[PDB]
Design an enzyme around this catalytic site. Structure first.
Site, PDB file in Angstrom:
ATOM      1  N   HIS A  41       1.095  -1.137  -0.169  1.00 53.54           N
ATOM      2  CA  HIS A  41      -0.140   0.018  -0.007  1.00 53.54           C
ATOM      3  C   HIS A  41       0.797   1.140   0.099  1.00 53.54           C
ATOM      4  O   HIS A  41       0.049   2.570   0.006  1.00 53.54           O
ATOM      5  CB  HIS A  41      -1.178   0.144   1.223  1.00 53.54           C
ATOM      6  CG  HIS A  41      -0.501   0.310   2.754  1.00 53.54           C
ATOM      7  ND1 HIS A  41      -0.460  -0.773   3.315  1.00 53.54           N
ATOM      8  CD2 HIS A  41      -0.088   1.323   3.138  1.00 53.54           C
ATOM      9  CE1 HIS A  41      -0.034  -0.432   4.446  1.00 53.54           C
ATOM     10  NE2 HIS A  41       0.287   1.128   4.101  1.00 53.54           N
ATOM     11  N   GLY A 143       2.365   6.050   9.862  1.00 54.10           N
ATOM     12  CA  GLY A 143       3.780   5.993   9.364  1.00 54.10           C
ATOM     13  C   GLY A 143       4.484   4.730   9.864  1.00 54.10           C
ATOM     14  O   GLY A 143       5.552   4.559   9.346  1.00 54.10           O
ATOM     15  N   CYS A 145       3.567   1.577   9.255  1.00 57.83           N
ATOM     16  CA  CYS A 145       3.444   0.603   8.485  1.00 57.83           C
ATOM     17  C   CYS A 145       5.040   0.149   7.818  1.00 57.83           C
ATOM     18  O   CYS A 145       5.756   0.784   7.668  1.00 57.83           O
ATOM     19  CB  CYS A 145       2.588   0.745   7.360  1.00 57.83           C
ATOM     20  SG  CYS A 145       0.887   1.203   7.938  1.00 57.83           S
TER      21      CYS A 145
HETATM   22  C1  LS0 Z   1      -3.207   5.018  10.752  1.00 51.88           C
HETATM   23  C2  LS0 Z   1      -2.394   3.570  11.128  1.00 51.88           C
HETATM   24  C3  LS0 Z   1      -2.487   3.783  12.828  1.00 51.88           C
HETATM   25  C4  LS0 Z   1      -2.085   2.413  13.033  1.00 51.88           C
HETATM   26  N1  LS0 Z   1      -1.424   1.325  12.178  1.00 51.88           N
HETATM   27  C5  LS0 Z   1      -1.443   1.662  10.850  1.00 51.88           C
HETATM   28  C6  LS0 Z   1      -2.022   2.899  10.408  1.00 51.88           C
HETATM   29  N2  LS0 Z   1      -2.241   3.074   8.940  1.00 51.88           N
HETATM   30  C7  LS0 Z   1      -3.037   2.203   8.066  1.00 51.88           C
HETATM   31  O1  LS0 Z   1      -3.873   1.560   8.582  1.00 51.88           O
HETATM   32  C8  LS0 Z   1      -3.088   2.831   6.630  1.00 51.88           C
HETATM   33  N3  LS0 Z   1      -4.121   2.436   6.079  1.00 51.88           N
HETATM   34  C9  LS0 Z   1      -5.377   3.261   5.902  1.00 51.88           C
HETATM   35  C10 LS0 Z   1      -6.283   2.442   5.259  1.00 51.88           C
HETATM   36  C11 LS0 Z   1      -5.949   1.282   5.002  1.00 51.88           C
HETATM   37  C12 LS0 Z   1      -6.402   0.189   4.431  1.00 51.88           C
HETATM   38  C13 LS0 Z   1      -5.703  -1.159   4.519  1.00 51.88           C
HETATM   39  C14 LS0 Z   1      -4.419  -0.987   4.685  1.00 51.88           C
HETATM   40  F1  LS0 Z   1      -3.880  -2.055   4.541  1.00 51.88           F
HETATM   41  C15 LS0 Z   1      -3.682   0.088   5.356  1.00 51.88           C
HETATM   42  C16 LS0 Z   1      -4.388   1.157   5.378  1.00 51.88           C
END
Ligand code: LS0
Ligand code: LS0
Lengths: 304, 304
Positions: A41, A143, A145
């Site tokens: 992603h 951030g 990820c």
């Molecule tokens: C904001 C945050 C806080 C903590 N851990 C991770 C995140 N980030 C996300 O989740 C990014 N993100 C947003 C939509 C979505 C859908 C699918 C996916 F694989 C990632 C996705």
């Protein structure tokens, strides 16, 4: 003596963390040999996440669009491919800090350490467990990820998790290092509710043995039980059923303390039925389930 | 989202751990520049610990008696001195892995990460707090002496603790990196009972703010209190008195959440008086006091 939620020393993993940027998205990558691993992603904009076609989105991306920075130095990207939900960025330089490593797909109930990172930089390390519903109760912000979960056996790092997303319920989902999600989760911003978060019974027993080893023994009783009788109680309290394999894995702890597994199950049964009555076990007022029998032996023996 | 007992990434400290052996005793040393720091009781036998005369014991030791090994390579000892309860072993080689560092003497209530080591090798990392009675509730076995506590600000490691001993009650005592014990403890095997382990009130409030930030809000009530009224409750429950300095340090958390410090004190007051009623806060069934207001801000913002 003393018992703590201990994480593996993170140095070997810190040397692998890099920053990956594609367009306006920046997340963490894992650099091992001449390959950088990161969540696919990274190619998406926030708007793309509602229903992304990763194959179509990836067609518009070339090697020069993936900006990979290790500390303050830029890595040259000479190839890119998508394996399930991860991208593999071939770089022209092998990571000189690459430790001995393996990619493992863990089972629910197993524990691992997480090195939380932002912009390729480590922020902290904590111990996690893969829940029976395949989520992890982590600590991650936007951030984070690409941050990874791992276990260490002497000099070999076994990478088991890569962080991908936060579910609307505040729990976390991610993949193994082959890009396969743990559980039914998809890398899409949709209704993905988590299943029942059951308690990892074998881990609670291992932690009860850890408590006895460290002096906390008030919960020991004069009773015993059977696997089937204990499991009737375990089902009522949303605990995983205990199997003979679990009893077998608890054998070394049973041998060290001289407390038979089924006697410890009877202590657990009374703790489930009567509660802690305002008391604590290893500084906790609830039954801890994120220590495996192996974790207890390791911490109680001092394996480095 | 999510909130975890997070430790600093330990890599910078792992590169400093060495093994120090004197006679038949082996413990951990900290190698920074051309100096190895280690507990002075490395010169003792188990029998010496009852009443050791460290100055007299050290007279029989020469540079060649301190065996310092960094991984598989031997360091040459060209000088030795005792500073309070630590030995400083001058070696002929500066540690090439020496990070930017400082030696700090922390105050009770402050938190730090511990890299537990055995034979100069890291076993794990966990987050601790210096208790108000100057002990630490760690996880250490025989051989862990010389393991260190530290904090990290971007690239600078502030070393605050070096492990020396376990009290008969299973709690831990040690020194700062100048060799001065925290609290009244001495490096002698005698009756050294610990004082009252009070709860670090400012940290519990910081953790309550962390809970509100992450969605756990059931404990918020319609009440307020005053510092003096809250402190009457805090004294009854062996909590540290809350001062205006503590209120001031909680200012950024109060500003972020829009919950005035004294309103949060009233939530804490009701939690002390009525208990949790079988409920949890950030996965805990007790009031957590080993997160400082700075820790909460750091984790909730993602400082790397
Ligand atoms: C904001 C945050 C806080 C903590 N851990 C991770 C995140 N980030 C996300 O989740 C990014 N993100 C947003 C939509 C979505 C859908 C699918 C996916 F694989 C990632 C996705
Ligand atoms: C066994 C263990 C477990 C956990 N942490 C540390 C230890 N080790 C010790 O305490 C060593 N040791 C024994 C007697 C004594 C007296 C004073 C002192 F400074 C050290 C002393």
């Amino acid at each position: 003596s003393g018992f703590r939620k201990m994480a593996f020393p993170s140095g070997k993993v810190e040397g692998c963390m890099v920053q990956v940027t594609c367009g306006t998205t920046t997340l963490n990558g894992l650099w091992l040999d001449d390959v950088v691993y990161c969540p696919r992603h990274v190619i998406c904009t926030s708007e793309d996440m509602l229903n992304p076609n990763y194959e179509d989105l990836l067609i518009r991306k070339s090697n020069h669009n993936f900006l990979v920075q290790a500390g303050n130095v830029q890595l040259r990207v000479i190839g890119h491919s998508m394996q399930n939900c991860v991208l593999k960025l071939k770089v022209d330089t092998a990571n000189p800090k690459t430790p001995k490593y393996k990619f493992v797909r863990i089972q629910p109930g197993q524990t691992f350490s997480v090195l939380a990172c932002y912009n390729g930089s480590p922020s902290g390390v904590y111990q996690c467990a893969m829940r029976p519903n395949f989520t992890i109760k982590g600590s991650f912000l936007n951030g984070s990820c690409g941050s990874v979960g791992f276990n260490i056996d002497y000099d070999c790092v076994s990478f088991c998790y890569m962080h991908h997303m936060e579910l609307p319920t505040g729990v976390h989902a991610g993949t193994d290092l082959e890009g396969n999600f743990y559980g039914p989760f998809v890398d899409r911003q949709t209704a993905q509710a988590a299943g029942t978060d059951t308690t990892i019974t074998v881990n609670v027993l291992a932690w009860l043995y850890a408590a006895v080893i460290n002096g906390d023994r008030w919960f020991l009783n004069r009773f015993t039980t059977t696997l089937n009788d204990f499991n009737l109680v375990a089902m009522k309290y949303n605990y995983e059923p205990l199997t003979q394999d679990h009893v077998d894995i608890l054998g070394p702890l049973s041998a060290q303390t001289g407390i038979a597994v089924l006697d410890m199950c009877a202590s657990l049964k009374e703790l489930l039925q009567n509660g802690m009555n305002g008391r604590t076990i290893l500084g906790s007022a609830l039954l801890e389930d994120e220590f495996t029998p192996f974790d207890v032996v390791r911490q109680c023996s001092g394996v480095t």
